[PDB]
Each structure stands twice: as structure tokens, then as C-alpha cells.
Amino acid sequence: LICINDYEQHAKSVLPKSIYDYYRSGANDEETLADNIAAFSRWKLYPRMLRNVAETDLSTSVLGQRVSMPICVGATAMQRMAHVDGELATVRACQSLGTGMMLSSWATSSIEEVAEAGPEALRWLQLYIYKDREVTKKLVRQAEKMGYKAIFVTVDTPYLGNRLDDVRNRFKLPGLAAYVAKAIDPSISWEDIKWLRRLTSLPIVAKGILRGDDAREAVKHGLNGILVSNHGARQLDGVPATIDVLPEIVEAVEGKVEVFLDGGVRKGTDVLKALALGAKAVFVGRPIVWGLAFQGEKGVQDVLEILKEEFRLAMALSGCQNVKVIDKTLVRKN
Amino acid sequence: LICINDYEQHAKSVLPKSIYDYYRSGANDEETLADNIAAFSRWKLYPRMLRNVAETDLSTSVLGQRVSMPICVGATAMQRMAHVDGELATVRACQSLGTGMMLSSWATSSIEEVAEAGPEALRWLQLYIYKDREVTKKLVRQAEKMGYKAIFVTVDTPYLGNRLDDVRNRFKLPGLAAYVAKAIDPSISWEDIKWLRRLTSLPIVAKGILRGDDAREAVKHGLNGILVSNHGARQLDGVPATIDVLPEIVEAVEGKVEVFLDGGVRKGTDVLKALALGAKAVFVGRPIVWGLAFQGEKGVQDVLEILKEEFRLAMALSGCQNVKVIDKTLVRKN
Amino acid sequence: LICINDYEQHAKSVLPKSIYDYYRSGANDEETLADNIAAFSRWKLYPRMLRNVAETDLSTSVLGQRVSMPICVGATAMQRMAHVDGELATVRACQSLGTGMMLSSWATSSIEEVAEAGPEALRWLQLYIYKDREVTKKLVRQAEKMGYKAIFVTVDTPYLGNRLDDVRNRFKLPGLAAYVAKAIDPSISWEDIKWLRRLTSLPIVAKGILRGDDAREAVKHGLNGILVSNHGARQLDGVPATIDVLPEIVEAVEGKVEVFLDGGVRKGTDVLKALALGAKAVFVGRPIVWGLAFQGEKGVQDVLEILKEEFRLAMALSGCQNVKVIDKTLVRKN
Amino acid sequence: LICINDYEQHAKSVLPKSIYDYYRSGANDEETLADNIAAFSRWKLYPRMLRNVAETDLSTSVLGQRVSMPICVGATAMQRMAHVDGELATVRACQSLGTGMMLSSWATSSIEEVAEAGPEALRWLQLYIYKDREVTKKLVRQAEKMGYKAIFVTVDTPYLGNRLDDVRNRFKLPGLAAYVAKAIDPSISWEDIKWLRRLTSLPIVAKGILRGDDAREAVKHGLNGILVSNHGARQLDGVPATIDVLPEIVEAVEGKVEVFLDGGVRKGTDVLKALALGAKAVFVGRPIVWGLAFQGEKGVQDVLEILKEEFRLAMALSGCQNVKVIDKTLVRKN
Numbered sequence A, B, C, D: 001l002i003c004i005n006d007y008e009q010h011a012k013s014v015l016p017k018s019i020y021d022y023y024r025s026g027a028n029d030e031e032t033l034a035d036n037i038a039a040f041s042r043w044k045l046y047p048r049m050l051r052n053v054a055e056t057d058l059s060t061s062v063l064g065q066r067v068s069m070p071i072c073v074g075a076t077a078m079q080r081m082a083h084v085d086g087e088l089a090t091v092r093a094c095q096s097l098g099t100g101m102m103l104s105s106w107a108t109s110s111i112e113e114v115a116e117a118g119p120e121a122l123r124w125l126q127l128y129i130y131k132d133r134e135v136t137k138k139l140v141r142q143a144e145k146m147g148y149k150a151i152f153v154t155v156d157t158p159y160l161g162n163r164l165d166d167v168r169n170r171f172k173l174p175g176l177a178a179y180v181a182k183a184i185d186p187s188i189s190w191e192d193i194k195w196l197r198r199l200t201s202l203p204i205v206a207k208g209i210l211r212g213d214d215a216r217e218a219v220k221h222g223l224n225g226i227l228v229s230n231h232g233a234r235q236l237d238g239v240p241a242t243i244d245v246l247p248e249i250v251e252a253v254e255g256k257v258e259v260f261l262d263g264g265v266r267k268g269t270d271v272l273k274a275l276a277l278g279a280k281a282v283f284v285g286r287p288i289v290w291g292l293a294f295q296g297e298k299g300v301q302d303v304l305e306i307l308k309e310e311f312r313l314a315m316a317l318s319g320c321q322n323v324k325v326i327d328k329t330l331v332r333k334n
């Protein structure tokens, strides 16, 4: 297969409508789902010519840890619905490639099983502050023990988003909105973030910030990064594309913490634009799932290599031999 | 049924083309009809994270009177064409929900019958200043006697709008433009508003203002609110979407009177954007009619509950525990 | 028939493709043809409420002469291809309605025959400065003798525009680009306009100006008006919609001469927007031809009455009792 | 055939999908391919009236050499795939017309064979700085010996662009990305341009610059022109349309060297807009290939004459008797 969009159409075939719709969906009318993609098109590239691009180096670092490319795997729940191997395939592919994986909450594999499947792979844990604070506490402890290098706290889901396709055909695995309400605490504030900060010395990244002020607030509370994310357009519909908010957030943080982006990344040029606008790395969600549905582990590895090569070429044609050379002048919005 | 747009398609089935077309239509080319919806999409949401949203309270007040949500039923004529119960179903549903209903002119039920059907429901009367001033005078007196809490004077209809579908297949119930010309006085000015002001101490709201200067003029003449309305895009085609004019009107009124909006509200996020831009409450027109055509009273109650829950979720995901927390920074226009 | 767009589809039926295509076409890719219509949609209306609109008066004046409405018939060549009566039907309909007609060059009726068919109708002559100056001279003399009240000099056609459909199927009546090259002088400058000015004391209007500087130049050379026109999008494709250039031209002329508009007028609201932006009257081209193809004289009269009533309603709903009340604040561009 | 777009559809018929797709393609999603065309539509024309346009003269000069029109043939590889005569047909047609041809790298004809086929035709050579510097050196020497009047150095291809259709069906003539990597040196910098400058006293034009700073840098290094080009949208997708970047480049160069444009030119009005924005001449790529596929030499000659006449008419209708009269005020962007 040639590009990421071919993988989605192949996953559509191999997967039951019920399950493909769950992975594909955005919230309500899917205005933001469409805009995550479209916004990248509105950012035009202004490449520099005649720079030595012979040995294009894609390596960078995420929160102190080296990675082979600024493209890492984002947290998506219930990966075993896409392929029998699920999270284990994902993490093994990340290991092959030298990139990191964010293990999702409601993963279809344990934190321990993931660690063992990819012992040398870079691993981070995505987590919610649950009603039962002890559950959050145990997860953090387990992540520390099992060699996970960061905690991503998702802050944009006091309740689960209203995804129309999920209701039209009811859904379950051994609706979804009720399970979230029982477990995830809608009352949480910056005080509950102070608690999480004292709970661990691991780098914590606030996942799902879309506002400048909230970003400054994250910095003030001693967190170590912002993942600019609209939760794959699955939460509040009508929020801007994450590539559009990224500038405001990059500027608000004033270089004090690393800023990352997910939502809409499907091409090498997407990666380049995000890094030009100031993101340190990007995360992909759906593309990994589509890879998984096609060929499990080899599917994920293929998806990440297609993105890797596309990013290498896009870097080369922009006159960027390494990631440190990328700058704001490479992009301008129409 | 899941969302408001499903109700319209169901009403299309159950209703004769002649009658569905009457409820659906805008004026001339329906440019504004389309824009009432589309404009909401152009207003993007910038939600705050990590605010306590455990006990989301949707209650507010309209012209001194408490309501359960900032979503109230707008005036639409001839509701018995949609369902045998018409206005009686509508008002009973509003009573169940704790919201208000604007009784329309040319209602298929009397002011007295409506009052009795929903004695404890919040009720307002929509009215025109008719040629025969006594007819207007009696209606006002009746509204005072029957427990109606406000008068909405529609000021945007000196003549009836040209709705193409209404002419293509002639229309009637025991064309429409002739009945309006006989009854509604096209000569009326702010002097006729001075008259209406002295006529009653009930709160009067100017319904159908689209200009800043006209809004200031309404304030100057001692009226108690502005309903920013383009009459469901049924009057002058080529006027802006009401969500677009709302800022100019909110600013022109300088907090001296409450400002409301109708036209295009179909989703919880619509409600949120209107309130963010400064409206106190919104009115829905067509959605109530579609509810009525589907299941009469239960249909209207369902429509309003779908909107209610959608607004609750949208509020929660924006970090708004109550309506007093909503502010201008929640929205920015593309 | 209800609106102007219904007339075009009826004319499509009754006319041979060859002849309908000639009347319909724009130049090259028809970018401007589309934009003449579309631009009107981008101008939004901001109506005033509660102004006495009981006796809406549509009468105004064109170059000193009273007319019943600011909607007049523009010059279109070869009207007998659409209906046996051609120009005679057109002028008789204008007489019925109390509006003016611009007789076209290459009319399928003589200046004398037109004058006799509508003796009391307001008549102007459209003219080119031909290579043979005597032909232009005779036409001017004839127009003076036959009671024509103005000369419209078309200045945007040194050569005929390239209309793709006209070449695909060759065309003729007892190609077209060769006849223009033989007759119309491509060398003409403002000096040839000085000549035309001294030739007659009739009001002369420069037809087809699209630039501010050219408009000032027309004023300087003692002409009496500007018809802002892109020749029905038939000349240079990729020029702006005439409703877009009208502001720049209205401002450049500084109230020294009357300014008119044609191109794209199909609805009453079009007329209103043009007058709001400062035009004194508008001309319609194609709609008259479509009227003619449907019912000859009654067809033209119907077309003009539909426009008349639509303009009356649009005026009323904007709060304009007469044309003198229309002002720039009625419109704002998106 | 009437216009350039008819030629593409005819070439689609006569050519195998494999070969048509190679000539047609852009890079990745073809965002820029579409925008090269679309951007011209966004530049509107503001024609002057009543200027003597009797003897419209289209002649100008490219790098000191007279040409019959500001429309020249751009470099496209492997022209014999389109027609048995290939480059020989192209150059003979340019000779007939009095315009120049840029001979492409990977031409299906030798530099010597081209020179002989069109001895009196204006000829320039397009070239890459190859890994083997001697190959570049020989080409330059040969171009000097064989009467070529300029060297166009393509600077936007350190690696070949990723054209999806080329991979879907593999391609070859007695994939393509491997041949480029073996031959074209991705390491080259402005120092390798200094080398090329000392290598010849022929005018050198930097082909494929899209940035203002890079243009200034080209000027500083003693080059003689900039060809504003995005390589027919075949390299980095998501770069602006060349007509959009042309202003920034024209201004950055401050009249010190001639600036040219290719990419998207299909109509006479395109040529006019490019020259209005400050380009001295434009190059066409694909249209020549489509001409070639239809009727070889007569096909190319037809294509160039259609463009020539369309440009003549567009010039005339703008009030431009010659190319020296074209100015920035003729265009404004929407």
C-alpha cells in the first residue's frame, strides 16, 4: 500500500461496520473531524533551495528521550478489536522503528504485558484522574515500575463525547458513555493536577489543551509539556483544528515546555508543518489502527515507515538536513 | 431518534409536501435559510479544561422569570397542521421541561385554550400591531388576564415575505400574502411602539431587529429586550445569519436589556455559541414543528430534551458548570 | 412563471441550442459570468424596522427623465432571433411599464421602427464609434431626430470577446468576430470621445467602464454618466463582478455624474443592493431576451413586473418608502 | 481544437494511461497541481478603456534575445513518449512562432540533434548539477558550442518528488526516483552555484525558486534571472501556486534580474496576469506535451498559436498595445 488513506479503505473492508465506525467517528456533526485534515491544506510550505540535504537526519527527542523521528504513536483504546495482537503489535513496531508509544487507558492489554512485549521501546502512559483516586495512583506506580518514561494526563474528557454512529448501533467488548461516567471524575480541577504532580517525578504532559491560558496554567503547575489535541475530534465538536491552535499555544508557553500535536496527521508534510509551527513531535491515532487492521504488527510498521519516508522527503525538499533547521518561515497560512 | 435533523426527515414523510414546504421554506432563493445554519459552523469553540463540571446547572431566567434552560419555544403559526393537538401539545411539553413558549399569532388555538392546557408553563405572546388597533389592544388585555408574562412584537413584517414554494402549490387552512396585507399595518413606526408601551406594563420584546441602531432605538423607547431574528429566513432574503448580527446588537444595547436569538438553532453547541456571544436565551422554531409532526406532545418533549442534553454536554466540555460562567472568549469566528 | 430563472429554462426549451448559447454565453471559461450572479449573494442586507412603508414609491429618474422604477432594459443585439417581434415587443413593454429601453447596435429593427412602436416610451441608443465615422454620425443624428434621450457609447469592445460556444457551432443571421473587426474601430481613444461630445448635446453615457481612473476621465471629458458594465461577462473574462467594482466607481465620480449598473441583475434584492451602493438605476440584459422567447411582448412585460414587485417588497422590508431613502448602510460585504 | 483544455482530453485518448498519468501528475495529494490553475482565477483584471489598440504588438525579449511573445516552451523530459518526433517537433514549432524552447534534461533527443532541427530557433538548456560534475561541465560546453543562449539550473530537486500514479503502475523507457538519486547530487549548495557561475559567461537562470530570500541570494551570486516555478507541482506538494509567490519574488529582486513564471498557464489571460505582476515571460509545460500527443509539430504550433491569439485579445481588451504598457494596476487579488 502506498499512502495512509489506502489503509483506511482496507480497514473498512476487513472490519465490521460497528467497529470501523467506532474508530473513524468524530463528535456530533464531525465538523472538527473534517477540519483536522483540511487545516493542514491551508498551511502552505515555502521551501529553501540549495542547502546540503545529503544525509537527512530525522532523529529528535521527546521529553529528554531520543527517538528516530518526530512521529510517535498516540493513545487509542481497545486495539484488539482491530487485530488479535493489539497493543503488543503496536509496541513491537515502535521498537523496530525507534519511536515511542503512548499506551492508552482502556487498553486491551495490561501495562505489564506491553512492557514485556517491547522492553526496549520508548513507552509512555496515558491516564485519566479517576473518581477512585487509588486507581490513578496504582497506574502511576505501575508505570514507574514497568519502565514507562512519562504520564500523559487527558484533561478534555470530564464526560465522553457524543459520537452519533456509536448510538445508532450499540457497542460493547469483553453504551460506552456510561462506563466513562462511572470511572472518570468530572469534578477535577487544577488542584487535582497539583496532586498528580506531587505523586510522581516522571514528566507529566497535559493532553488535550486547546487554549493559551490553560497552557500557561499547565506550565505554572509544574507540568512538562502540552499535547495540543482535540481528542481526534471525538469530544466537543466545533473546536478548531489542532494545527490552527498550535501557534497560539506554542507562543503562550514561551519555550518553557515542549509542545506536541495530534489530530489529522496523515502525511509527511503534515509532520513538517507542525514542527515548523513549533511542535517538537506529533502523534498519530487512527492511522495506527488502520495499520493494525491490515497486517497487525507489519501493518503498524508499514504505516510508520510510510510516514517516516514522506517526512524525510518533505524535509529534504524544504532544505532541512535535520529537525533543528526547521523554522517558522517554512509555513504561512492562507 | 438521535438528533434534530432526523426529526425533519421524519416530518417530511408524515406530512404532505404542501405543508412540509410551508414549514421548511425561506424567502426567494433561501440564501439566508442556509446561512442561519452555516454561520454557526464558522464560530469555533475554545473550551477551558479542568474546571469542576460535576453538577452542570442549565437554569437561567428570561425577563425576570426562571427557566430550566436557555432554550425556549419560538412562535410558529398554525401548529395544528402538523398534529391534531398543535399548540396544546407544545405548551404541555414546555411545562414538563420548565421552559417557556411564545404563542404565535395565527395560532390554531385560542389564547385561553393555551393558558388552560399549560397553566403553570411560562407563556409569552407574539403579536403584530394590526391595522385595526383594537385587535392588538384586545390581545394584550387577554394576555394580561390569562397569565402571559411578556409581549413579543414582531417588527420585521410590514408585508409577508415571498416564499417560492408557497406560490408553486397554493395553500390554505380553515394565498397567505393577502391575509397579511388586510390585517398587518405596513405604516407602523416607533410612534406605534410608544403606543404599545403605554398600553401595558408587561415586558415587551422587539422581535426581528437586525441592526445596532434599531436596537438602541428599541432601548430608547422603553422596551425590555431584543430578539435578534430574521424571521426564520422567511422575510427579506440576503440578510445575515442571526448568529452573525448578534455581536453588533449585544454591543449596541450595552447591557441595558436582555438580548435573545433565534434562527438556525439545531444543536446544543449552537445554544452555547449564542450565549457566549451574549444572548441570554435562544428560541427554536422549525424543530418544534418537526417534533410535533412525529409524536405530538412527546415529539416536542423529545426535541427539547435532545437539545437540553446536548447543551449540557457542550457546557460541560467547555468547562462551564453554569450559564453565568459562559463568556465571549469561548468563541472566535473564522 | 414565478421568477426570472424559470424564464431562462423555458427559453432553453423554445430556442435552438445555437441561439440559446449565443444569448447565454460569457467569454472563455465564464468565470465572470458566474461571478456577476454570485457577487450579489456576498452583499448582505441590513434592513431598518418600523419605518412607514405603506405607499412604497419606486419612481426615480435617469438622466433627467422620469421612470417608474430604477430597472431599465439594456442593449442586447438581434432580438428577433428570440421572437418574431423582437425590439418592437421590448419597447412596447417598456412603454406599458413606464421604464426606458436602450436600443442596441445590430438591432433587428431600425431606429425609426422602434421610435414608432413605442412613441411615448423612454428610449436611449447604444452605439459604437465605428471605423467609418459617418455611420456613427448618422446614428447620432437619427437618434436626435427620432426622440431618443441619450447616447450610450460602449467603450469595452475594441475587438469582440472570445465566446467558446459561438465557435463550436458556427452562427449567422440575415463568424461574428469578423463583422466586428470590419466595423468597430479598435484605435479609438479619449480624443474620439471629445469628438462624440461636440457631435451632440444629448446626454452621453460611457458604457463598460470598470476602473476608477477611467471614470474620472469620463467625467473630465464632459460625459453625463457611467454605466458600470462588463458587457454581460462577454468580453474580457476574469474581470470582477460589476456589483464589486460599483463602489470604487461611485466614489471616484464624487457625485458629479449618475452611475448605473448592469450584469447579474435577476432579483429585486439585486436592484436594492446596487442602489444602496450608489447606482441610480440598473439595466437587465438576458432576462429580457428570456421573456421575449417565452411570450414576446407579454413575456418582457411579465419579466419587468416580476422584478418590479420583487424590488417593491425588498424596499418595503428594508424600511424604504422611496428610492431617496436607500443608503450605503443597507449593505455590507462578506 | 478551440482551447488548451481540449488538447489534454484528446491526449488522454491517444496515450496509454501509464504515460498520460506520468505527464499529468503532481506530487502526493496534488494540492498544488490544482492551485496552480485555481490561483489565476483569484487574480482579477481591471482593464483600461479607450487606448489605441489597433496594432497590438506581442514581441518582447528574454535575457537580451528577442521573442515574438512572452510565451516560451518549458523543459519537460521524455517528449518522444508523446510523439515519435518529440523534441524535434517542439523546437521546429518554436522556430515557426519566433519563441524560445528550454531543452529539458533527460530529453529523448541530443543537444546536437535539437540544435540542427531548429538552427534559427531560440534555444536554452535546462540542467541539473549532477554528482559527476563532469557531466554538468560537458553539457554546459555543448550548449555553448551548439548555440544555446542560456542555462536554466533547476534547484528544487535534490530528490525526485513522490508522484502517486507513477508508483501504482511502474514506469520505464529505453522506478524513476532511483535514476535521479544516482545522478542528481542532493548535497549541492550556493557554493556549487558559484562554481557554475565561473564555468560559463552564458546567462544562468535559477529555476524553481519560491522564496524571496533565495531570490536575493541568486542575485547576489551573479545569476541572471529567476524562474518562479514549483516544478509543475511535481516536487513538494503544499507549496503555493507560482502566480501567488511571483509578487514576493518580483519585489525581492528589485528589478536587478528578469523574473519568469511557469506552472498553471493555460490561457491568454494567465499570461497577462503574470506579466502584470512583473514577470517578463512565462513558460508552458504540459500544454506542449498535449499538443505533441495530438499532432506532433502541428499540435505544438497550434497550442502556441491559441495561447498567442488569446494573449493578443486579452492585451487588447485591457488597453495594452504592447507589453511595455502592462502594469501592476491591471490586477488585484480577491
Ligand SMILES: Cc1cc2nc3c(=O)[nH]c(=O)nc-3n(C[C@H](O)[C@H](O)[C@H](O)COP(=O)(O)O)c2cc1C
Pocket: A022, A023, A024, A036, A074, A075, A076, A077, A104, A105, A106, A126, A154, A207, A229, A230, A231, A232, A233, A234, A262, A263, A264, A265, A283, A284, A285, A286, A287
Ligand atoms: C479509536 C480512538 C480511541 C481513542 N482513545 C483515547 C483514549 O483512550 N485516551 C485519550 O487520551 N485519547 C484517545 N483518543 C484520541 C487520541 O489519543 C488522539 O488524540 C487522536 O487519535 C489523534 O487524532 P488522529 O486519530 O487523527 O491521529 C482516541 C482516538 C481514537 C480515534
Ligand SMILES: Cc1cc2nc3c(=O)[nH]c(=O)nc-3n(C[C@H](O)[C@H](O)[C@H](O)COP(=O)(O)O)c2cc1C
Pocket: B022, B023, B024, B036, B074, B075, B076, B077, B104, B105, B106, B126, B154, B207, B229, B230, B231, B232, B233, B234, B262, B263, B264, B265, B283, B284, B285, B286, B287
Ligand atoms: C412555520 C413558521 C411560522 C412562523 N410564524 C411566525 C409568526 O407567526 N410570527 C413571528 O413573529 N414569527 C414567525 N416565525 C418565525 C419564528 O418565530 C422564528 O423566528 C424562526 O422560526 C426561528 O428560526 P428556526 O425555525 O430556524 O428555529 C415563523 C417561522 C416558521 C418556520
Ligand SMILES: Cc1cc2nc3c(=O)[nH]c(=O)nc-3n(C[C@H](O)[C@H](O)[C@H](O)COP(=O)(O)O)c2cc1C
Pocket: C022, C023, C024, C036, C074, C075, C076, C077, C104, C105, C106, C126, C154, C207, C229, C230, C231, C232, C233, C234, C262, C263, C264, C265, C283, C284, C285, C286, C287
Ligand atoms: C445577447 C447579448 C447581446 C449584447 N449586445 C450588446 C451590444 O450590442 N452592445 C452593448 O453595448 N452591449 C451588449 N450586451 C451587453 C448588455 O448591454 C449588458 O451589458 C448585459 O447584458 C448585462 O448583463 P445581464 O445579461 O446579466 O443582464 C449584450 C449582452 C448579451 C447577453
Ligand SMILES: Cc1cc2nc3c(=O)[nH]c(=O)nc-3n(C[C@H](O)[C@H](O)[C@H](O)COP(=O)(O)O)c2cc1C
Pocket: D022, D023, D024, D036, D074, D075, D076, D077, D104, D105, D106, D126, D154, D207, D229, D230, D231, D232, D233, D234, D262, D263, D264, D265, D283, D284, D285, D286, D287
Ligand atoms: C512531464 C513533466 C516533465 C518535467 N521535466 C522537467 C525536467 O526535466 N526539468 C525541470 O527543471 N523541470 C521539469 N518539469 C517542470 C517544467 O519545467 C515546468 O516547471 C512545469 O511543467 C510548468 O507547469 P505546467 O506543466 O503547468 O505548464 C517537468 C514537468 C512535467 C509536467
Ligand SMILES: O=C([O-])c1nnsc1Sc1ccc(Cl)cc1
Pocket: A077, A078, A105, A106, A157, A176, A179, A180, A231, A234
Ligand atoms: O475516544 C475514545 O474512544 C475514548 N477516549 N477515552 S476512552 C475512549 S473509548 C472507551 C473505551 C472503553 C470504555 Cl470502558 C469506555 C470508553
Ligand SMILES: O=C([O-])c1nnsc1Sc1ccc(Cl)cc1
Pocket: B077, B078, B105, B106, B157, B176, B179, B180, B231, B234
Ligand atoms: O413565517 C410565517 O409563516 C408567518 N409569520 N407571520 S404570519 C405567518 S404565516 C400565516 C399564517 C396564517 C395567515 Cl392568515 C397568514 C400568514
Ligand SMILES: O=C([O-])c1nnsc1Sc1ccc(Cl)cc1
Pocket: C077, C078, C105, C106, C157, C176, C179, C180, C231, C234
Ligand atoms: O455581446 C454581444 O453579443 C455583442 N456586443 N456588441 S455586438 C454583439 S453580437 C453581434 C451581433 C451582430 C454582429 Cl454583425 C456582430 C456582433
Ligand SMILES: O=C([O-])c1nnsc1Sc1ccc(Cl)cc1
Pocket: D077, D078, D105, D106, D157, D176, D179, D180, D231, D234
Ligand atoms: O517532473 C519530472 O518528470 C522530472 N523532472 N526532472 S527529471 C523528471 S522525470 C525523469 C525522466 C527520466 C529519468 Cl532517467 C528520471 C526522471
